């Protein structure tokens, strides 16, 4: 028998915890007979900043963290690509893709823990206050919240006054009026209770793309991991890789139509932008990108394979996950 330390920043009664935090575990130990149980702690409930979830598992103070590597400025500076202006497809797709980019491409850059799945979200949206978002023109001079570094660079190139926060600080942000709205996907926003403190939000037509999507990372302690029975190695093997990373995608986005219904019920304005003012997002956002590849090729990786190949990789997971 093992007991393995979870911990992650989502709250208990949020759509991830309970649809793949929670499942995943139940299944592991389902699968093991009962040979692995977890001690699970949400909410950063063992301390610490979100940033320091990667750490902790590595330093092995706890054995499973869930997080976005993107909290951890430039740590992880190659599976930025997938954070890029319209990148993503599905979540599922993509989030095949980042698991196969990562194994094949860039095995190093998580290499200090045993990673399990990798994924993004489903497509970003935007929650403000007081401003309707029609057109990129509306952001300017907005306080706009983002995950990471590379969302962060897109919302400026919008216009927008752009703050790097995690999730849990987004109500005493919107509370004390430090910004004005936040990049989210839906499925997320009740967790929160965005909609009770926003009342705008723009999401963008399927046609026109996902102006963005963040990625996310379920890594284990190495000693851990390699101090498991060979039998139960197998069941956490089992429960890693490319199909764990497209379902821990397709579920997370699964959850968009929940955040969508409860922004609905308490009478919010949602808006759809079409495709073709999505056009004028991706012009203004279009040197992201290019600036990602010059970045990768200064850190001495090849950055326009990396882009290319992770184009590839979208393409051809989507034939799958369509």
Same mark, same amino acid.
């Given at each position: 028998?093992?007991?393995?330390?979870?911990?992650?920043?989502?709250?208990?009664?949020?759509?991830?915890?309970?649809?793949?935090?929670?499942?995943?575990?139940?299944?592991?130990?389902?699968?093991?007979?009962?040979?692995?149980?977890?001690?699970?702690?949400?909410?950063?409930?063992?301390?610490? +900043?979100?940033?320091?979830?990667?750490?902790?598992?590595?330093?092995?103070?706890?054995?499973?963290?869930?997080?976005?590597?993107?909290?951890?400025?430039?740590?992880?500076?190659?599976?930025?690509?997938?954070?890029?202006?319209?990148?993503?497809?599905?979540?599922?797709?993509?989030?095949?893709?980042?698991?196969?980019?990562?194994?094949?491409?860039?095995?190093?850059?998580?290499?200090?823990?045993?990673?399990?799945?990798?994924?993004?979200?489903?497509?970003?949206?935007?929650?403000?206050?007081?401003?309707?978002?029609?057109?990129?023109?509306?952001?300017?001079?907005?306080?706009?919240?983002?995950?990471?570094?590379?969302?962060?660079?897109?919302?400026?190139?919008?216009?927008?006054?752009?703050?790097?926060?995690?999730?849990?600080?987004?109500?005493?942000?919107?509370?004390?009026?430090?910004?004005?709205?936040?990049?989210?996907?839906?499925?997320?926003?009740?967790?929160?209770?965005?909609?009770?403190?926003?009342?705008?939000? +723009?999401?963008?037509?399927?046609?026109?793309?996902?102006?963005?999507?963040?990625?996310?990372?379920?890594?284990?302690?190495?000693?851990?991991?390699?101090?498991?029975?060979?039998?139960?190695?197998?069941?956490?093997?089992?429960?890693?890789?490319?199909?764990?990373?497209?379902?821990?995608?397709?579920?997370?986005?699964?959850?968009?139509?929940?955040?969508?219904?409860?922004?609905?019920?308490?009478?919010?304005?949602?808006?759809?932008?079409?495709?073709?003012?999505?056009?004028?997002?991706?012009?203004?956002?279009?040197?992201?990108?290019?600036?990602?590849?010059?970045?990768?090729?200064?850190?001495?990786?090849?950055?326009?394979?990396?882009?290319?190949?992770?184009?590839?990789?979208?393409?051809?997971?989507?034939?799958?996950?369509?």
């Amino acid at each position: 028998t093992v007991t393995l330390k979870f911990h992650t920043f989502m709250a208990p009664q949020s759509n991830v915890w309970q649809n793949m935090h929670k499942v995943w575990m139940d299944k592991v130990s389902k699968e093991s007979g009962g040979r692995i149980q977890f001690e699970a702690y949400p909410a950063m409930q063992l301390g610490g +900043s979100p940033a320091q979830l990667y750490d902790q598992a590595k330093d092995g103070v706890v054995d499973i963290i869930w997080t976005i590597p993107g909290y951890t400025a430039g740590r992880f500076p190659r599976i930025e690509v997938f954070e890029l202006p319209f990148m993503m497809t599905n979540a599922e797709a993509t989030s095949r893709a980042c698991w196969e980019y990562m194994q094949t491409m860039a095995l190093d850059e998580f290499k200090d823990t045993q990673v399990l799945a990798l994924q993004v979200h489903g497509p970003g949206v935007f929650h403000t206050k007081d401003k309707q978002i029609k057109t990129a023109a509306d952001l300017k001079g907005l306080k706009m919240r983002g995950p990471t570094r590379q969302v962060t660079k897109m919302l400026g190139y919008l216009g927008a006054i752009p703050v790097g926060m995690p999730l849990p600080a987004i109500p005493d942000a919107l509370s004390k009026g430090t910004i004005d709205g936040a990049a989210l996907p839906w499925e997320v926003v009740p967790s929160v209770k965005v909609h009770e403190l926003t009342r705008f939000h +723009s999401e963008f037509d399927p046609a026109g793309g996902a102006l963005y999507t963040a990625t996310f990372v379920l890594a284990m302690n190495k000693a851990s991991y390699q101090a498991l029975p060979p039998d139960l190695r197998k069941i956490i093997d089992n429960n890693s890789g490319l199909q764990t990373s497209g379902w821990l995608g397709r579920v997370q986005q699964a959850g968009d139509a929940a955040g969508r219904q409860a922004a609905l019920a308490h009478k919010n304005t949602i808006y759809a932008i079409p495709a073709l003012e999505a056009q004028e997002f991706k012009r203004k956002a279009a040197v992201v990108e290019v600036a990602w590849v010059e970045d990768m090729n200064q850190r001495g990786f090849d950055g326009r394979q990396l882009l290319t190949t992770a184009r590839a990789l979208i393409a051809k997971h989507s034939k799958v996950a369509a």
